[PDB]
Amino acid sequence: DIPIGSKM
Amino acid sequence: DSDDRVTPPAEPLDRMPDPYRPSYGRAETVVNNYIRKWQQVYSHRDGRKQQMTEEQREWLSYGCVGVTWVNSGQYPTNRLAFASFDEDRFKNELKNGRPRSGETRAEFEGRVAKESFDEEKGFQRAREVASVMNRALENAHDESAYLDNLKKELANGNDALRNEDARSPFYSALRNTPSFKERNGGNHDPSRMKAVIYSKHFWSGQDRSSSADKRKYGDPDAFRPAPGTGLVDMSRDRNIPRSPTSPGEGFVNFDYGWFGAQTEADADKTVWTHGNHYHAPNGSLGAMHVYESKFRNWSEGYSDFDRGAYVITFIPKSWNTAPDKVKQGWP
């Protein structure tokens, strides 16, 4: 999915 | 080598956090240490300190969303959201201003729309609405009484929120809170709940079928608050980040900041809790750090986000994740 965890 | 997300280990209930202090309005500490502080001042259930559970520690480890996830007991939906937008300034600066040295008209319009928001008034609006909701649920022991109390004060206050649909995110915010229906939480009694506030920073150009200009410079018509109410329709927010302008440019998709229910009248003296990224001390990004920022430090935002929404949800009064006072650092 859309990754979260604030990796750009 | 794995930049995999790891869950911080359990911290004993007696373990005190290491000291730290804010610098120029913002304090930070490693997530393992903030768990110790959270367990001392935020973990109380009916005044009894608790250890942060394995599940809560897992939620927290996902980054900026983790603080709000843990404190509200639910992954943020952003269903009920408010913001302030100066329509007259936006229209005037469009028809009177001009793009600066090195700006496409799509970049100029995107920036002017960004600078037309007022995050102080947006947080102030969510403050006054949350106060109306708390007064409505004070002595209401069923949802029907809460809705009757809520509509009564909105109508007497001539608030445009009174005309919201019965099934709108505003009127359904309490009944759609999972902890409101739980027998250990609200137990279908509004008087056992409390309205809390967190904030979300995000990008406006999230339509994947729109022009590349809006994906790279923003959609001015997107995520504007409705007049009168100030409500923001967050249904089309899909956690999509700002598109890069040049190869290699990376942007973060969103940021979540937990306010809670502090009583401090100075917006600028309110503290907002957020994390920098998910927890990976054995990986590239490193360990997750929890930041405690004054409002102006939080509302300063970044170029990654051109939108700010101030969200209202509910937690049981028995919790202590939204105390009257929040102190940066430790002790």
**B178-200 burial, b if ≥16 CB within 10 A, otherwise e?**
ebbeeeebbeebbebbbbbbbbb
B283-287 long-range Cβ contacts below 8 angstroms, 24+ apart: B283/B1, B283/B2, B283/B3, B283/B4, B284/B3, B285/A5, B285/A7, B285/B3, B287/B30, B287/B31, B287/B32
**Partner-chain residue, chosen from A2, A5, A8, that has the shortest CB–CB distance to B63:** A5
Q: How many contacts, defined by CB atoms under 8 Å, are there between A and B?
A: 35
Axis crossing angle, helix B119-137 with helix B143-156, rounded to the nearest 10:
130
Residue B22's Cα: distance from chain center in Å? 21
Angstroms from B62 CA to nearest CA on chain A: 5
Residue among B159, B219, B237, B255 flagged as catalytic: B255
Method: X-ray
Residue B212's Cα: distance from chain center in Å? 28
CATH number of the domain enclosing B179? 3.90.1360.10
Residue-by-residue DSSP string for B169-190: TTTTTTTT-HHHHSTTTTTT-G
Q: How many domains does chain B have?
A: 1
In chain A, % helix, strand, coil (3-state, to 5) comes to 0, 0, 100
Tell me how many degrees the CA angle B138-B139-B140 measures, rounded to the nearest 5: 100
Structure tokens at B146: 């809460």
Tell me which amino acid residue B132 is: V
Place of tokens 């729109």: B210
Structure tokens at B49: 């300190």
The whole domain housing B125 covers 1-331
Q: Which residues contact B151 (CB under 8 A, 6 or more apart)?
A: B162
Residue-by-residue DSSP string for B236-256: T---PPPPPSSTT-----EEE
The answer to whether B5 contacts A2, with C-beta atoms less than 8 Å apart, is: no
Pairing of strands B271-275, B289-294: antiparallel
Q: Looking only at Cα atoms, what is the longest distance across chain A?
A: 14
Angstroms from B307 CA to nearest CA on chain A: 17
C-alpha torsion sign, points B315, B320, B321, B322: positive
Q: Looking only at Cα atoms, what is the longest distance across chain B?
A: 61
Residue spans of alpha helices (H) in chain B? 31-41, 54-60, 64-72, 87-96, 105-115, 119-137, 143-156, 178-181, 212-217, 295-299
Residue-by-residue DSSP string for B52-85: PPHHHHHHHTTSHHHHHHHHHSS-----SEE--B
